[PDB]
Amino acid sequence: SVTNAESAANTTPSSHRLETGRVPALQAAETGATSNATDENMIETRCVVNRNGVLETTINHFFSRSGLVGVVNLTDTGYATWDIDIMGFVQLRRKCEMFTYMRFNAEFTFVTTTKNGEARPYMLQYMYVPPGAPKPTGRDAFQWQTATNPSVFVKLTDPPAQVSVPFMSPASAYQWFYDGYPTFGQHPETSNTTYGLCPNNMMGTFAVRVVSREASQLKLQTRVYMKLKHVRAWVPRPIRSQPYLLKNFPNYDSSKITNSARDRSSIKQAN
Amino acid sequence: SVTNAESAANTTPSSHRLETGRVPALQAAETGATSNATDENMIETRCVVNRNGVLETTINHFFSRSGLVGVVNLTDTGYATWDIDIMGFVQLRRKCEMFTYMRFNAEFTFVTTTKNGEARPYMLQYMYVPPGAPKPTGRDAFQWQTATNPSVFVKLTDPPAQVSVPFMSPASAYQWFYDGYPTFGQHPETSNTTYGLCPNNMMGTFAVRVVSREASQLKLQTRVYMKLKHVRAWVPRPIRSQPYLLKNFPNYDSSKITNSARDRSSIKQAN
Amino acid sequence: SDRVAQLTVGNSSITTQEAANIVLAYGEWPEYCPDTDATAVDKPTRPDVSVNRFYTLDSKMWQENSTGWYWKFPDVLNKTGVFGQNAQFHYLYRSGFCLHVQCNASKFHQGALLVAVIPEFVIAGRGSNTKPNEAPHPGFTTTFPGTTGATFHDPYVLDSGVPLSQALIYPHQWINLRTNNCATVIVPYINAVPFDSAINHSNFGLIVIPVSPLKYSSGATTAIPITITIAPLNSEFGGLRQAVSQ
Amino acid sequence: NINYYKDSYAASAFTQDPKKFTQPVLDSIRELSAPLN
Amino acid sequence: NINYYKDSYAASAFTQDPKKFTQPVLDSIRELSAPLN
Amino acid sequence: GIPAELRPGTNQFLTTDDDTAAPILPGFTPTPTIHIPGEVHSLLELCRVETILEVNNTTEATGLTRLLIPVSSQNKADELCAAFMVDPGRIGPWQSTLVGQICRYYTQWSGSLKVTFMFTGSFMATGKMLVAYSPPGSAQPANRETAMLGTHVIWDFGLQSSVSLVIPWISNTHFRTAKTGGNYDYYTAGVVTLWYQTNYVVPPETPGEAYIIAMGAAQDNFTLKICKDTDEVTQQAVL
Amino acid sequence: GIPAELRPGTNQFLTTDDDTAAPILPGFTPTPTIHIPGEVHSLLELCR
Numbered sequence A, B: 001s002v003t004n005a006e007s008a009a010n011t012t013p014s015s016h017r018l019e020t021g022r023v024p025a026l027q028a029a030e031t032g033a034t035s036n037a038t039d040e041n042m043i044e045t046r047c048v049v050n051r052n053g054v055l056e057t058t059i060n061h062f063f064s065r066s067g068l069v070g071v072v073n074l075t076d077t078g079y080a081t082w083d084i085d086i087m088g089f090v091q092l093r094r095k096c097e098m099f100t101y102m103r104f105n106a107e108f109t110f111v112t113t114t115k116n117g118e119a120r121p122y123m124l125q126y127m128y129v130p131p132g133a134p135k136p137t138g139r140d141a142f143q144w145q146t147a148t149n150p151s152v153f154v155k156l157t158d159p160p161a162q163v164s165v166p167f168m169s170p171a172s173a174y175q176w177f178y179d180g181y182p183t184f185g186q187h188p189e190t191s192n193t194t195y196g197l198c199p200n201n202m203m204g205t206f207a208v209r210v211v212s213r214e215a216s217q218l219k220l221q222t223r224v225y226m227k228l229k230h231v232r233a234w235v236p237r238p239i240r241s242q243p244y245l246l247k248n249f250p251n252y253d254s255s256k257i258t259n260s261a262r263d264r265s266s267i268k269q270a271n
Numbered sequence C: 001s002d003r004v005a006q007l008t009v010g011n012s013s014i015t016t017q018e019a020a021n022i023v024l025a026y027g028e029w030p031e032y033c034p035d036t037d038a039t040a041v042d043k044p045t046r047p048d049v050s051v052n053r054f055y056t057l058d059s060k061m062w063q064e065n066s067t068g069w070y071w072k073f074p075d076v077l078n079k080t081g082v083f084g085q086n087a088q089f090h091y092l093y094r095s096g097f098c099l100h101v102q103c104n105a106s107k108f109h110q111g112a113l114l115v116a117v118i119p120e121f122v123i124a125g126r127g128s129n130t131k132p133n134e135a136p137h138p139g140f141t142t143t144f145p146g147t148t149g150a151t152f153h154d155p156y157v158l159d160s161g162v163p164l165s166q167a168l169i170y171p172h173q174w175i176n177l178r179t180n181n182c183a184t185v186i187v188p189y190i191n192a193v194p195f196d197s198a199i200n201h202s203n204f205g206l207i208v209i210p211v212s213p214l215k216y217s218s219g220a221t222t223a224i225p226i227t228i229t230i231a232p233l234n235s236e237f238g239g240l241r242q243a244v245s246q
Numbered sequence D, E: 001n002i003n004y005y006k007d008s009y010a011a012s013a014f015t016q017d018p019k020k021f022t023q024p025v026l027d028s029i030r031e032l033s034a035p036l037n
Numbered sequence F: 001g002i003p004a005e006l007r008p009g010t011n012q013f014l015t016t017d018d019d020t021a022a023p024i025l026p027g028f029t030p031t032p033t034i035h036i037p038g039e040v041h042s043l044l045e046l047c048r049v050e051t052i053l054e055v056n057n058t059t060e061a062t063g064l065t066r067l068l069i070p071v072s073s074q075n076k077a078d079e080l081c082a083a084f085m086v087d088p089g090r091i092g093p094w095q096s097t098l099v100g101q102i103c104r105y106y107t108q109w110s111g112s113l114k115v116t117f118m119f120t121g122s123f124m125a126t127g128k129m130l131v132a133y134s135p136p137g138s139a140q141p142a143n144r145e146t147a148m149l150g151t152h153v154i155w156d157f158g159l160q161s162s163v164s165l166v167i168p169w170i171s172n173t174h175f176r177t178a179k180t181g182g183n184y185d186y187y188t189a190g191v192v193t194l195w196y197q198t199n200y201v202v203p204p205e206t207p208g209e210a211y212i213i214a215m216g217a218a219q220d221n222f223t224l225k226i227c228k229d230t231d232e233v234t235q236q237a238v239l
Numbered sequence G: 001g002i003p004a005e006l007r008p009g010t011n012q013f014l015t016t017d018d019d020t021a022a023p024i025l026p027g028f029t030p031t032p033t034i035h036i037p038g039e040v041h042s043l044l045e046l047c048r
């Protein structure tokens, strides 16, 4: 059944049991079910009214923090593109890969800095290119006319830009693990370069340029932070314990497998 | 009849037909009417409640995006004029020429940049000159006193200027295609330079200067973006498939006519 | 009860025994101008009999290597009868039309004709010239053909840079020589102004275009005539002054 | 939809009728019936 | 919870059910009773 | 005054933003509107109009004869006549139409399609045809018994000869991106083929070759979303 | 307009802040949700 909760659970007073047939201690872990032995049936306990707040452990409060999704280099080609995938950095990727399916909105923030670090009063255009839209081929091409694409003009001396992005998938949810092939036909035995590529997660390209007709002489890094909101999760799975190697693939190392618990002297010494 | 719609159409269950006289498949395209054969009379189908939103395909949502209408060069004469016509660029002109008549408001935006690209803290005056009003003849003439013309003072370090323009035509709608002559009399056979010029679309001049008494030494480009709003359309027509050659005329090339479908190997090979 | 038809207007009639349905352009019937949309002060005239009847233009030849024909309809009836006289003497004009196109053939011929109207059908000038003060523009007899019509040069782009495949968005019919021998299209007054002059401005234009060429076997009649009979339904004229031709 | 100006064109902004483009014919044709007799 | 936009995804943002992860068994097992007979 | 803070998004000019602007002409009232026939309210009204498909877009083809599918008498039975892909946002016969040029302004389309075949030929020439739509999977079928396993319609040449094959919505996902090729072969819609049921019979003194006009349109299930740009227009300098 | 003053905290991008942002796609409606078994609501369901 579904139960609500404003705080954690309370405890009721308990006494000593002296009788046969009533065994709350013997469980069965072979049945695939968690043990349910509570405190009131194990040890003599007192009554407490536990008013500790459990509100900040939900999915919304756990995921609604701006992490880091992507750094885009513009060491000025005149423009810089960036395929939108949130698996570049291993800080938010782990939290996202704690679950199998997620459906959420996004809130991008763009923090742009210079070579050493600075804010020169120039102009920057960020443009979103959906899958199929023409990607700009130059710093003054016509793809920057953005008659239908969402674009953002901001200065380096402005506060960091911020937009809100809806759920833009053709499926009903984003899946971080896809057990299958996007295409058909005969698949090779040597190198499956398309195994585990969900086409419902490719969202497009993010381009950035400096609005000019000449060529401004500066190199700059633009950082894209995402804050998830209105998030829903499905099918939780374990958290990764091995170091990451690739972006779109869960590759690990065959040799040199890191243990998930550090070594001690012996099993009979808890120190 | 007029029908409302919150989403797309639904489908009802269908069974097999075995009878004569009821033929929903044979149409008559000679009658100038579109076929009306639906799915429920063609193949056995199931029932679905289609809740896909059709809201973002209307005229208002299709035209209310800021495109590009005109770039004005001020490579400082001291001032720069620009005849107001939205047929300069082939991105918004195509969407506007999808229809015969359109009645709408405008929302101009002025984005001004420097030679390479910059924002020097100077002052700029944009002035609208209606048909008949005196056009400025210098950078310090009296036409810039704007006792009755709408003018805008903005700095280069300010956000881009924005105004809202009403329906300023003497007719009831803007027509993008005009089959006739504005004047009377004998018309020539050699060169009709006035064929297809609707006088109800000439709206005036847009002038721009730098507010000064000396001569500031900078060259600058000002871009005029238009966002249509409160738009109504009449008499839809096909979309142009040939490249554009002129602004006020639908000229194309006699030789080298581009086909509207790329070539393949044969008609019997769909690949 | 669907293929035989008769249309009587004024003192003229048109009978047909095989035909398609009667099309009505944009679902609107041509009627007189109301007192809300009107702006001119002087009272218009309404002959309603002498000007609302069937005027027949000359016949165009239907051969194997044809390209098409186009007319400007408020300009074809400027020399014919009381309608032409009223359109010359008066200054403002408003009416709807009804266009019938007859092209009959036997049961051994084959072909296809696309007959459609285009409101504000602008003729383009063929030639690659991007300079505005030198580009080639069409002549007066190309823009306003008159009661003798004008043939196309590139029916693939409608002589306007617009593909004729998408010309089915307009009010249109098909003359298929095995289904019907004629086509009919009733058109209201489509314009952004209530009254307009019928001399230097043509509202729309018909276009008959051979999509599937005319083919037959040896022995059959070769030259297939094409006739168009039109009717200015609900005519209104205004601003009577001296007569001008063009 | 709040407006801060005297003029209504400075403000901020489901009807369909395909039967005038798809079937603009005088005599209405049915679905299951043949178009021409 | 005030929103200034037409779209609801641009706005600003206690259910628990552990019995589908802890004890997802068909035959319900009691607390004081032994799990298997 | 009131205390306030400025947030990210300040001093930006968003293109597709919905915001008011200060007027220029005070106390203005425009010209009164009149009634003009043929007012459109959405773009789905233009997508349900038939429009000639360019199925004969191959080489060695003239200007207009690209719009016709040739049909003639055969000698071997079961022969194939024509074939084309269904994707409207893909280069081919669905590019000369009107639903293909409107669904190229939008990224994701949905709904069922409709293809109307009209027979331009002699009145004494008869015959039959089998139009078969095949969902994704293998390539174009090689036989007619392979094509009959899909979704087909048998259409004979008679007094009407204006058949209309519906193309139902058979997809896994709700929508399909209007970008195909390579890694986007996951959004293909199938193949529409045209075979010969019996033959194109014809009496003497009658031409032995006629044409089919194929037209394409959408249905009431049609839906479009995510406005993008088209790739038919190109411009180097201002006109 | 209205008189106003700006306070400390202006022009800062707080990471864990709860604030609205301007949308990019106007009039958007996402794909309809379906029922997927095993929806989690808090992290205390995984700890037991």
Ligand SMILES: CCCCCCCCCCCCC/C=C/[C@H](O)[C@H](N)CO
Binding pocket: A084, A085, A086, A087, A106, A108, A126, A127, A128, A150, A151, A152, A163, A165, A168, A174, A201, A202, A203, A204, A206, G024
């Ligand atoms: C330039 C201003 C607007 C910027 C628009 C960018 C937003 C479009 C992308 C939406 C991002 C959705 C969240 C991530 C999607 C998928 O899960 C990732 N590909 C994960 O691999």
Ligand SMILES: CCCCCCCCCCCCC/C=C/[C@H](O)[C@H](N)CO
Binding pocket: B084, B085, B086, B087, B106, B108, B126, B127, B128, B150, B151, B152, B163, B165, B168, B174, B201, B202, B203, B204, B206, F024
């Ligand atoms: C300087 C600040 C105010 C600027 C005022 C400029 C607005 C006046 C022009 C109105 C533009 C109406 C939209 C376009 C009109 C016609 O359709 C074009 N000439 C198309 O050829």
